[PDB]
Amino acid sequence: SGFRKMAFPSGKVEGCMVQVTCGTTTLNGLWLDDVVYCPRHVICTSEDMLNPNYEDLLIRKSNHNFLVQAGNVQLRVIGHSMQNCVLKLKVDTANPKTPKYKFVRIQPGQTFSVLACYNGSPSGVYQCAMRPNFTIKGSFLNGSCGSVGFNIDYDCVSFCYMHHMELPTGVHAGTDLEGNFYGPFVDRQTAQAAGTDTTITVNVLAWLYAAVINGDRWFLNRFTTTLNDFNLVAMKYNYEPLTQDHVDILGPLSAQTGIAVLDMCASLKELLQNGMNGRTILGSALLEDEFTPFDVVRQCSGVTFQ
Amino acid sequence: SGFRKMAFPSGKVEGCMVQVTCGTTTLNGLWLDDVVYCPRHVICTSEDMLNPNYEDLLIRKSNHNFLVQAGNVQLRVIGHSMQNCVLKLKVDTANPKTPKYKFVRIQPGQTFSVLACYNGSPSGVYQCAMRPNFTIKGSFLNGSCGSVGFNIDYDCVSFCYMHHMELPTGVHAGTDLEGNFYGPFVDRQTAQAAGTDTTITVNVLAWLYAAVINGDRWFLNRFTTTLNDFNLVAMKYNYEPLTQDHVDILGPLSAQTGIAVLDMCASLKELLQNGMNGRTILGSALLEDEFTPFDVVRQCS
Numbered sequence: 051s052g053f054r055k056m057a058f059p060s061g062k063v064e065g066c067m068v069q070v071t072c073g074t075t076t077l078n079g080l081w082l083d084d085v086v087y088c089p090r091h092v093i094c095t096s097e098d099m100l101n102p103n104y105e106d107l108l109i110r111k112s113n114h115n116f117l118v119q120a121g122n123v124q125l126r127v128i129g130h131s132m133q134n135c136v137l138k139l140k141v142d143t144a145n146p147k148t149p150k151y152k153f154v155r156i157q158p159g160q161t162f163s164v165l166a167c168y169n170g171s172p173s174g175v176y177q178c179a180m181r182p183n184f185t186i187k188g189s190f191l192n193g194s195c196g197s198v199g200f201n202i203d204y205d206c207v208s209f210c211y212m213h214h215m216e217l218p219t220g221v222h223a224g225t226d227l228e229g230n231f232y233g234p235f236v237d238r239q240t241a242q243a244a245g246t247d248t249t250i251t252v253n254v255l256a257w258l259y260a261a262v263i264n265g266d267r268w269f270l271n272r273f274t275t276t277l278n279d280f281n282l283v284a285m286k287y288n289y290e291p292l293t294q295d296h297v298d299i300l301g302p303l304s305a306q307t308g309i310a311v312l313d314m315c316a317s318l319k320e321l322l323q324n325g326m327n328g329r330t331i332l333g334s335a336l337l338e339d340e341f342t343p344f345d346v347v348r349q350c351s352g353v354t355f356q
Numbered sequence: 357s358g359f360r361k362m363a364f365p366s367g368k369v370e371g372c373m374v375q376v377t378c379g380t381t382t383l384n385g386l387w388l389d390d391v392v393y394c395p396r397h398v399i400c401t402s403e404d405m406l407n408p409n410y411e412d413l414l415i416r417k418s419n420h421n422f423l424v425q426a427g428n429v430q431l432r433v434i435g436h437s438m439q440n441c442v443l444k445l446k447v448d449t450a451n452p453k454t455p456k457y458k459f460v461r462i463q464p465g466q467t468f469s470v471l472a473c474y475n476g477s478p479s480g481v482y483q484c485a486m487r488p489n490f491t492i493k494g495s496f497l498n499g500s501c502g503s504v505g506f507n508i509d510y511d512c513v514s515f516c517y518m519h520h521m522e523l524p525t526g527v528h529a530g531t532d533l534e535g536n537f538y539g540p541f542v543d544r545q546t547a548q549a550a551g552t553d554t555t556i557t558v559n560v561l562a563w564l565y566a567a568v569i570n571g572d573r574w575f576l577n578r579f580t581t582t583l584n585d586f587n588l589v590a591m592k593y594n595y596e597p598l599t600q601d602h603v604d605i606l607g608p609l610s611a612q613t614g615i616a617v618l619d620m621c622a623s624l625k626e627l628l629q630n631g632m633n634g635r636t637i638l639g640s641a642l643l644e645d646e647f648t649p650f651d652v653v654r655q656c657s
């Protein structure tokens with residue numbers, strides 16, 4: 051029994067984290083086979099960052115300007131190039147700890163584990179959702195750029211996030227590992243803001259199923275509803291639309307608990323319209339939306355990784 | 357910026373997890389140097405749930421009754437001994453991945469990470485606190501026994517918890533790595549029930565200091581309190597007493613924020629009285645008690 055916000059075991063990614071220095075700037079890199087990946091903004095001074103020309107800044111650098119430390123060992127940079135907003139540093143040695151891995155770009159609503167790192171050294175691991183507004187509500191201090199986000203699918207690490215910056219509201223923005231930003235953001239010091247965010251409806255539902263599975267059942271009711279009626283309610287409360295695919299994805303949870311997705315939707319309708327009336331669900335007084343359907347099944351079935 | 361329930365990176369513990377089988381029972385073991393640690397109830401049969409005599413069950417076992425699998429590899433058991441409620445299986449290979457480590461018994465309110473595992477393989481990592489009633493609010497399925505809790509301090513892993521059982525209320529009980537149970541619990545299936553649980557007041561206060569550090573001040577007020585008046589109020593909300601030790605421990609965070617500890621206590625008293633009135637604090641609509649003073653300083657710097 052029990053239900054916790056849970057990250058993937060982070061060992062396979064810890065073995066890939068290195069320190070990357072360029073001039074006065076230190077941040078983290080991801081060392082896989084013989085390439086170290088990191089944010090291309092590592093090459094900027096504070097004035098460069100105001101309006102960088104990255105290709106120009108880069109051609110003036112050469113390999114020896116990139117100091118890469120793996121633990122206490124130096125790696126030799128033998129090539130450098132950019133792909134979108136990530137720098138790729140070719141090094142003279144493949145990472146003997148390279149896991150089975152893929153670069154995957156995730157969808158808003160999907161969750162992943164962040165391995166927060168400082169000076170190449172892993173400091174903490176936590177679970178994030180990619181918000182509908184393409185930010186993440188991370189926890190990062192200066193030095194954390196280049197920390198990565200990932201999922202594990204059997205024994206394959208799917209890397210999905212590299213940290214690049216913090217926005218003025220204190221939420222975080224970054225790229226996939228091919229350096230495409232999530233969201234309408236750019237790597238430069240200019241005025242940027244998170245858009246208004248919404249709540250991830252299918253995840254809230256998954257979490258209600260998790261609550262039922264763990265014995266927390268007070269919010270269930272005799273009613274059911276339709277997608278169209280419920281989606282009207284979601285719109286009014288700044289919830290994402292629920293699609294048939296979401297209903298399909300929640301299928302197993304509906305068969306297992308005896309609460310149909312639209313039966314649950316009627317519980318959620320009532321919760322949005324009336325609140326919790328002093329009660330909690332799985333220990334929370336607000337509706338949690340950072341567990342996917344897959345997260346809830348995984349944790350309530352005990353799947354493992356090697 | 358940001359504030360998250362964050363766990364320690366788990367890789368140093370992952371390379372210590374093994375599967376231990378005795379009879380028809382499989383659970384997890386922790387392999388450090390040439391010893392595998394696991395709950396002694398792995399030797400119980402369905403008859404031995406209620407009043408097992410562990411010394412009598414163990415003397416009947418030989419080394420080869422214990423199967424220990426590390427990844428794909430069988431380890432050879434060359435010795436066994438019991439210490440309190442843990443079994444220590446001596447094996448013929450020292451773990452090459454053994455980290456720097458120590459065994460530390462923690463006090464209620466302390467936090468630690470748990471590497472949940474099944475069949476010797478890690479499932480997930482999350483953050484827990486030792487509740488005042490010596491249980492933990494974990495996430496454990498059948499087959500999770502022998503999963504461990506830990507902190508990591510400058511590459512040294514301090515193992516503080518081994519998972520033994522789930523109580524009827526859904527909360528969890530276990531031992532330190534010397535095999536002594538936290539709280540009044542025993543490894544028998546006889547009805548036992550956790551003390552009424554209470555909120556970890558010193559941690560809530562730390563977390564309110566984290567909220568101020570991250571830019572949030574709406575819940576402060578112009579008042580202060582004596583320590584005794586605070587405790588008189590807070591125990592009516594099932595809050596643990598705040599001690600002068602706790603007041604001292606909050607000294608650094610008070611200094612950093614400029615809010616005296618007893619002034620923060622006054623803000624907490626009002627919050628218990630008023631609720632949050634539809635506001636949130638660090639993204640929560642409840643007061644959070646699973647961050648220690650030390651956690652807050654490490655996460656906020």
Ligand SMILES: Cn1nc(-c2ccc(Cl)cc2)cc1N
Pocket residue numbers: 091095096099214215236237238239240
């Ligand atoms: C001088 N400077 N530069 C930044 C910045 C902005 C966006 C990105 Cl992606 C990376 C860094 C913040 C400050 N203070």
Ligand SMILES: [Cl-]
Pocket residue numbers: 461462463466
């Ligand atoms: Cl302690």
Ligand code: NA
Pocket residue numbers: 270271272273274312313314315316317
């Ligand atoms: Na219903």
